[PDB]
Design a protein around this ligand. Structure first.
Ligand SMILES: Cc1cn([C@H]2C[C@H](O)[C@@H](COP(=O)(O)OP(=O)(O)[C@@H](Cl)P(=O)(O)O)O2)c(=O)[nH]c1=O
Ligand SMILES: [Cl-]
Ligand SMILES: [Mg+2]
Ligand code: NA
Ligand code: NA
Ligand code: NA
Length: 326
DNA sequence: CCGACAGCGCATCAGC
DNA sequence: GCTGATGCGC
DNA sequence: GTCGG
């Protein structure tokens, strides 16, 4: 990437804010500014040039000059010398270990990947799976593998019922050439706004995908969200594909477009879009867009026949998925 | 010179 | 066991 | 940490 030095610096600072400081707004400030710089098709030569882009303010501007002049930030190399913070930063890379579990492990002298393996009985189920697949979960999914995973998933849900609708969202739907995980929006013509005839629909889909040994592990399970692990089959004598993370969301169809807007992202896009909706008197979640009252109460769901309908309520021009990569 | 910063699903734990 | 918070994740 | 009021 063209400005990868700057975007790497900003990402590291962002990871520090989230993993150690727990300064979630600082986290989001660095990652927003990293996002715009990464999408900027021009080689940033100074913090002043950077300060013209949205998200880049005084302090990021200053840090870009320091990095462009020295190749590093003082703040970053003091963090890399802090052994508690660096241990914490590493442990939060394991799926299921956050700042709270990380600093509890550090205080027990659990500090390295091998330490975790030696004390696996101290991990909850999620953390075990993150540890088991730690290397795999550091690997990106080439788009060609996403296509083969989409192939299995979409056919399998048709097998459990031919009217099922499955849409692979996330970065894949935005056109990314590789993705971190797989995000599947699932909906069924029989399933409208939580009208209770018979739930259990997600379990049936999960069951079938376990049956064919595509889904290999379970991180979470409820009526609307399944999170877990999956794997492409190999031909005889190829290396196994890495295990991959998978999130499947079951949503009523009348909420399908709010659902696919949410699951397509990006997370920063959703934050920006939902904030702007607040600025126009609405609130957006993965299910509905509602009007906000003068006092904060939310209204009844508004009708939606397309993603574009939601952009229209808040007076945005429609952005195609490939330009939502904020 | 300040306060806002999206909104949710699920698993686990602390205290009862 | 339940509530309610905290934790981690999307 | 940024931005908007
Ligand atoms: C983390 C996050 C995700 N989402 C929505 C929006 C988001 O697009 C969707 C999937 O979450 P994802 O973590 O899989 O993000 P992704 O775009 O797929 C890429 Cl980062 P990759 O996974 O390909 O590496 O969930 C949010 O709305 N808020 C969030 O805080
Ligand atoms: Cl913050
Ligand atoms: Mg994803
Ligand atoms: Na600016
Ligand atoms: Na993690
Ligand atoms: Na995900």
């Amino acid at each position: 990437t063209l400005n990868g030095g700057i975007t790497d610096m900003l990402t590291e600072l962002a990871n520090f804010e989230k993993n150690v400081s727990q300064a979630i707004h600082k986290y989001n400030a660095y990652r927003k500014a990293a996002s715009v710089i990464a999408k900027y098709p021009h080689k940033i030569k100074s913090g002043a040039e950077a300060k013209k882009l949205p998200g880049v303010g005084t302090k990021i501007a200053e840090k870009i000059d320091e990095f462009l002049a020295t190749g590093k930030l003082r703040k970053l190399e003091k963090i890399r010398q802090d052994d508690t913070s660096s241990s914490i930063n590493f442990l939060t890379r394991v799926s299921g270990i956050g700042p709270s579990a990380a600093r509890k492990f550090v205080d027990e002298g659990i500090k390295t990947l091998e330490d975790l393996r030696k004390n696996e009985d101290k991990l909850n189920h999620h953390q075990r799976i993150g540890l088991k697949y730690f290397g795999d979960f550091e690997k990106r999914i080439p788009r060609e593998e996403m296509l083969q995973m989409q192939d299995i998933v979409l056919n399998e849900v048709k097998k459990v019922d031919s009217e099922y609708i499955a849409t692979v969202c996330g970065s894949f739907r935005r056109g990314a050439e590789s993705s971190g995980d797989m995000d599947v929006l699932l909906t069924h013509p029989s399933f409208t706004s939580e009208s209770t005839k018979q739930p259990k629909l997600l379990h049936q889909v999960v069951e079938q995908l376990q049956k064919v040994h595509f889904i290999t592990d379970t991180l979470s399970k409820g009526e609307t969200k399944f999170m877990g692990v999956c794997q492409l089959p190999s031909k005889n004598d190829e290396k196994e594909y890495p295990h991959r993370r998978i999130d499947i969301r079951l949503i009523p169809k009348d909420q399908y477009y709010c659902g696919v807007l949410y699951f397509t992202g990006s997370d920063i896009f959703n934050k920006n879009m939902r904030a702007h909706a607040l600025e126009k008197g609405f609130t957006i979640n993965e299910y509905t867009i509602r009007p906000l009252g003068v006092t904060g109460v939310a209204g009844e769901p508004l009708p939606v026949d397309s993603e574009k309908d939601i952009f229209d309520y808040i007076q945005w021009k429609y952005r195609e998925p490939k330009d939502r990569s904020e």
